[PDB]
Amino acid sequence: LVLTQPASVSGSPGQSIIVSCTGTSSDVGGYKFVSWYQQHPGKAPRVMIYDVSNRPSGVSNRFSGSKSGNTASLTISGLQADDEADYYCSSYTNSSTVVFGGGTKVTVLGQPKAAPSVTLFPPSSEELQANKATLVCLISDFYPGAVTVAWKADSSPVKAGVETTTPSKQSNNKYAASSYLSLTPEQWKSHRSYSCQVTHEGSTVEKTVAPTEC
Amino acid sequence: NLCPFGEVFNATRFASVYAWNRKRISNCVADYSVLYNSASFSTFKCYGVSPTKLNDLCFTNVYADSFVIRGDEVRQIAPGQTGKIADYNYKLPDDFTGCVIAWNSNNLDSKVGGNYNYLYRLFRKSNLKPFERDISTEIYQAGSTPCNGVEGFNCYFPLQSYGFQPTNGVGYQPYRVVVLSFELLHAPATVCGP
Amino acid sequence: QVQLVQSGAEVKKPGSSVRVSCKASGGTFSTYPISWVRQAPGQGLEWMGGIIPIFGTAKSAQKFQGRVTITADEFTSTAYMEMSSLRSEDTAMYYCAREGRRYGSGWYISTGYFDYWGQGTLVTVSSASTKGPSVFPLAPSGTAALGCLVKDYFPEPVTVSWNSGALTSGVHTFPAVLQSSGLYSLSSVVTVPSSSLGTQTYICNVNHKPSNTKVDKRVEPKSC
Ligand SMILES: *[C@@H]1O[C@H](CO[C@@H]2O[C@@H](C)[C@@H](O)[C@@H](O)[C@@H]2O)[C@@H](O[C@@H]2O[C@H](CO)[C@@H](O)[C@H](O)[C@H]2NC(C)=O)[C@H](O)[C@H]1NC(C)=O
Ligand SMILES: *[C@@H]1O[C@H](CO)[C@@H](O)[C@H](O)[C@H]1NC(C)=O
Numbered sequence: 075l076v077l078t079q080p081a082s083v084s085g086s087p088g089q090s091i092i093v094s095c096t097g098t099s100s101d102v103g104g105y106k107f108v109s110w111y112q113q114h115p116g117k118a119p120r121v122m123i124y125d126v127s128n129r130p131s132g133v134s135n136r137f138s139g140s141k142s143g144n145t146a147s148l149t150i151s152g153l154q155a156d157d158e159a160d161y162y163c164s165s166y167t168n169s170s171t172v173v174f175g176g177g178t179k180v181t182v183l184g185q186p187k188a189a190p191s192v193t194l195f196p197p198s199s200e201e202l203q204a205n206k207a208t209l210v211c212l213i214s215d216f217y218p219g220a221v222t223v224a225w226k227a228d229s230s231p232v233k234a235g236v237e238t239t240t241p242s243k244q245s246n247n248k249y250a251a252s253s254y255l256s257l258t259p260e261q262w263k264s265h266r267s268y269s270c271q272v273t274h275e276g277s278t279v280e281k282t283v284a285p286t287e288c
Numbered sequence: 289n290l291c292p293f294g295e296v297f298n299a300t301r302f303a304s305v306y307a308w309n310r311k312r313i314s315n316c317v318a319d320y321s322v323l324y325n326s327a328s329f330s331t332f333k334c335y336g337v338s339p340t341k342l343n344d345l346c347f348t349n350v351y352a353d354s355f356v357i358r359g360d361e362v363r364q365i366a367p368g369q370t371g372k373i374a375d376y377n378y379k380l381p382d383d384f385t386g387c388v389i390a391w392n393s394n395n396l397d398s399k400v401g402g403n404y405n406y407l408y409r410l411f412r413k414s415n416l417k418p419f420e421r422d423i424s425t426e427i428y429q430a431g432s433t434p435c436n437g438v439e440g441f442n443c444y445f446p447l448q449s450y451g452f453q454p455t456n457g458v459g460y461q462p463y464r465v466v467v468l469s470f471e472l473l474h475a476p477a478t479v480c481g482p
Numbered sequence: 483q484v485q486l487v488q489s490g491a492e493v494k495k496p497g498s499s500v501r502v503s504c505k506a507s508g509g510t511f512s513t514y515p516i517s518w519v520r521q522a523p524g525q526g527l528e529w530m531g532g533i534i535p536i537f538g539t540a541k542s543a544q545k546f547q548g549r550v551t552i553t554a555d556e557f558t559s560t561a562y563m564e565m566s567s568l569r570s571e572d573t574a575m576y577y578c579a580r581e582g583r584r585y586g587s588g589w590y591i592s593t594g595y596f597d598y599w600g601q602g603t604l605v606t607v608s609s610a611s612t613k614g615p616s617v618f619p620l621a622p623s624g625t626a627a628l629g630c631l632v633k634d635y636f637p638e639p640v641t642v643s644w645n646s647g648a649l650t651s652g653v654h655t656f657p658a659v660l661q662s663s664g665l666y667s668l669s670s671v672v673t674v675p676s677s678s679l680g681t682q683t684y685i686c687n688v689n690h691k692p693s694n695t696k697v698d699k700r701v702e703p704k705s706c
Contacts, residue, residue: 076526107593111527118577118599119519119527125595130582162527164594171543172517172529172594193627193671195620201631210620210631212671214654237659244654252656252669288706404510405556425536425587437589445584449510 077102077163077175085153086184093148093178095163101173103144107166110139110148114159115243122161123148155182155247183218187275188248190216194270194281197262207262209255211270211281216241218275219249226269227261291316291479293323296352297389302397302464305377306409306447307423308355315478318350319343329389330463331362336385336470343481349471350479353378353419356397356406358450360459362390365467376409378467381418386469397452397462404449406462411446419469483508484598486578490691491604493612493637499566504578504600511559512536515581517592518552518563520574521602523638532592533561534585541591568607575602606637606692610664614695615640617688620669621704622679629671630686630699634663641689642670649684679703 078096085091093110095102102108108126111119121130123139126146136151146165150157163175190213197207213221219241225232235256241249253270262268262285269282291313303309320342324332337345357365357373364374367384374380380388397403411428424446427435431442439445452462489503504516517532531542535554542550551564561578578600581592615635622628632640642655655670670686680703688697 105593107595109594109596111596113527118579118602119596120599121582121596124582130597164527164529166590166593169544170541170591172532172592174519174527174529177526195629195631198618198621198631201618201633204616204618206633208618208631208633210669212627212629212656212669214627214671214673237661239657239659242654242657250654250656252659254659254667256661401507402509404559405512407510407513427584427586435586437586438593439584439586445513445586447513449513 075101075167075173077165077173079161079163079175079178081176082179082181084181084183085150087153087155087182089153090149090151091153091180093150093161093163093180094145095147095165095175096145097165097173098144100168101165102141102146102163104168105166106141108139108141108146109164110137110146111162111164112159113162119162150180153182155185158182158243158247185217185247188215188217189277190214190221190272190274190279192270192272192279192281194283196268196283196285196287197257197259202259202262205259207257207259209257209268209270209283211253211255211272213241213251213253213272215244215246215248215250216274217248219243220274221251222273223251223253224271224273225253225255226271227265228267289316291318291350293318293352296354296466297323299354302354302356302393304405304407305355305357305373306407308353308378308421310421311352311354313350313352313479314348317482318479319482323389329391331388331390333366334387335367339387342470346477346480347470348473348475348477348479351469351471353467353469354465356393356450356462356464357408358452358459359392359461359463362463362465365390365465372408372410375415376412376422377416379416379418379420380467384469385472386467388465388467390463390465392458392461393464394452394454394456394461397464398454398456399452400454403452403462406450406452407447408450409446410448411444484580486580486598486600488576488578488600488603491606491637491639493606493608493610493692494568495609496568496570496607498568499564500568500605502563502576502578502603502605504561506559506561506580511554512556513584515585515590515592516554516561517579517581517596518550518561519577519579519596521577522571522574525574529592529594530563532581534591537587539591568605570607573605573607575604577602604637604639608637610636612636612693613665614693615688615690615697617686617697617699619699619701620671621701622674622676623704624676625673626676626679627671627673628684628701628703629669630688630701631667631669632688633667634661634665635667635690635693636665637692638666639691640666640668641691642668643687644670644672645683645685646687
């Protein structure tokens with residue numbers, strides 16, 4: 075059984091937002107044993123609220139919890155960029171089990187926009203000596219976290235052998251992304267230039283590398 | 289047919305004091321002064337008799353109660369004592385007929401980072417009667433609010449762990465304790481000296 | 483100072499069984515409920531079950547009954563989760579989670595209040611065999627970016643540090659990509675002062691536990 079949470083909740087800094095969690099009278103509506111957990115990427119969950127509204131020591135008072143009927147709610151006040159995370163509700167059940175909600179991704183909108191810095195790495199000599207070639211286009215310090223990546227050989231579009239990551243949150247609350255263009259050494263030697271094009275919020279930045287750059 | 293005192297004294301693991309172990313000793317020969325003629329025992333105090341006489345006496349039964357406490361609580365294993373151990377964990381009667389033996393077990397029951405497996409009852413509604421054993425695990429209701437089996441404000445889990453680290457002060461180091469009580473019934477006596 | 487330390491990530495064939503361990507340190511073990519919670523990649527949390535060691539009582543979700551065994555060793559302060567007949571949908575991060583409070587005998591195993599968590603253990607159910615990563619430098623030429631590219635490994639995860647943990651500021655290790663070859667590759671980058679490029683040492687330390695492999699790769703500037 076999955077408790078029903080909104081897939082996404084967004085707010086601006088200083089705004090107050092609410093994550094809901096709806097169960098039945100056999101779980102959320104049957105007991106006061108509802109908890110709320112915060113999970114940042116790559117980390118274990120951290121309890122923010124337990125027993126509907128009790129806050130553990132060390133949790134900021136901006137987080138509070140309530141419950142009515144079959145629906146519990148986590149209210150986050152004074153929204154900050156570091157509150158960006160997945161939030162899960164948990165509940166005891168009439169089967170004496172614990173069930174989790176599906177999770178809600180909390181994102182902070184309206185932070186200052188940032189243009190992406192882009193670095194394009196050509197194939198290293200060691201990889202070429204291993205008979206492979208990887209162009210690595212790394213994109214850093216942009217906000218909002220949405221970019222488009224295009225690859226050009228000379229001036230011709232390329233799609234074969236391209237893999238791009240979903241933007242990940244850095245440590246400074248900006249975003250970063252990675253894109254890889256896989257080539258054989260012969261294809262790398264065979265062209266005059268190679269270009270990575272990153273578009274972000276109407277802006278376009280382009281970086282170029284060439285095999286004859288030495 | 290020597291009494292199996294090595295089973296009790298030389299046991300690999302000892303019980304937590306709240307669930308102190310009791311072994312009955314009957315139909316055997318009890319050469320007591322193997323013990324007492326041992327400097328290994330930091331405590332060897334007999335109350336109903338003195339042990340050099342016990343090789344000359346006979347009893348119906350002998351109960352060996354074993355457990356682990358911490359150093360500064362060894363004084364509580366004696367008649368007419370108060371404290372957490374004497375009141376909530378192991379109580380000796382005022383008319384105690386027997387011996388209390390104890391030794392420092394820091395090298396066995398302490399661990400780097402702390403051994404937390406030995407427990408004692410920290411909260412109880414009333415004091416124990418002599419030789420009463422309480423192994424209950426009900427949340428202790430300290431206030432006026434019922435607890436409903438959930439620990440929290442004014443609702444304490446009744447058992448606490450000792451924190452046994454090798455670098456603890458001697459009063460906080462673990463001590464293994466064996467209490468021998470000598471039971472004299474109006475039946476044939478079954479344990480004797482040589 | 484309670485700490486839950488779990489065993490390392492691994493790959494297991496379909497139909498085999500796995501044991502995840504979680505050693506508890508710095509506090510009482512026997513009286514606290516311990517639960518196991520798993521998270522499929524990019525998915526939500528799901529409670530598997532729990533145990534109170536001193537009571538010898540346990541409870542698992544019905545979907546895990548007969549397939550999952552949760553046990554405890556009180557003398558080594560270690561909880562265990564064992565899963566048999568592994569399916570690919572069992573590929574997940576498995577977490578040890580201690581309850582934030584205790585319960586009296588005859589009451590609850592867990593009410594969903596977890597205070598301490600283990601670091602997590604990635605179990606990948608697959609018939610493909612492990613292969614160590616190939617680490618190549620991404621050389622630099624204000625500030626300048628450098629890094630290393632960790633290529634063609636299986637399964638997840640790979641951990642990346644810089645200068646044995648003495649370089650963490652400005653570091654970003656990207657999510658891995660699943661190449662058409664079925665192997666994983668990621669990059670880790672760091673932005674550094676350009677004045678430091680000739681003097682400071684930059685070494686990326688890659689750990690791949692499923693292959694018990696560690697790779698140190700020095701990243702030097704390109705001078706061509
Ligand atoms: C645990 O609860 C389920 C569900 O209870 C039903 O749904 C709730 C939202 C509420 O409306 C309850 O009053 C309902 O009974 C129980 O399952 C039901 O069992 C009854 C009795 O056999 C049956 O008539 C219903 O059809 C069942 N409903 C469902 C959805 O399965 C279940 O028995 C409870 N278990 C325990 C141990 O109490
Ligand atoms: C415990 O072992 C020692 C060493 O073997 C022995 O001398 C001693 O008698 C034993 N204790 C008892 C009660 O037998």
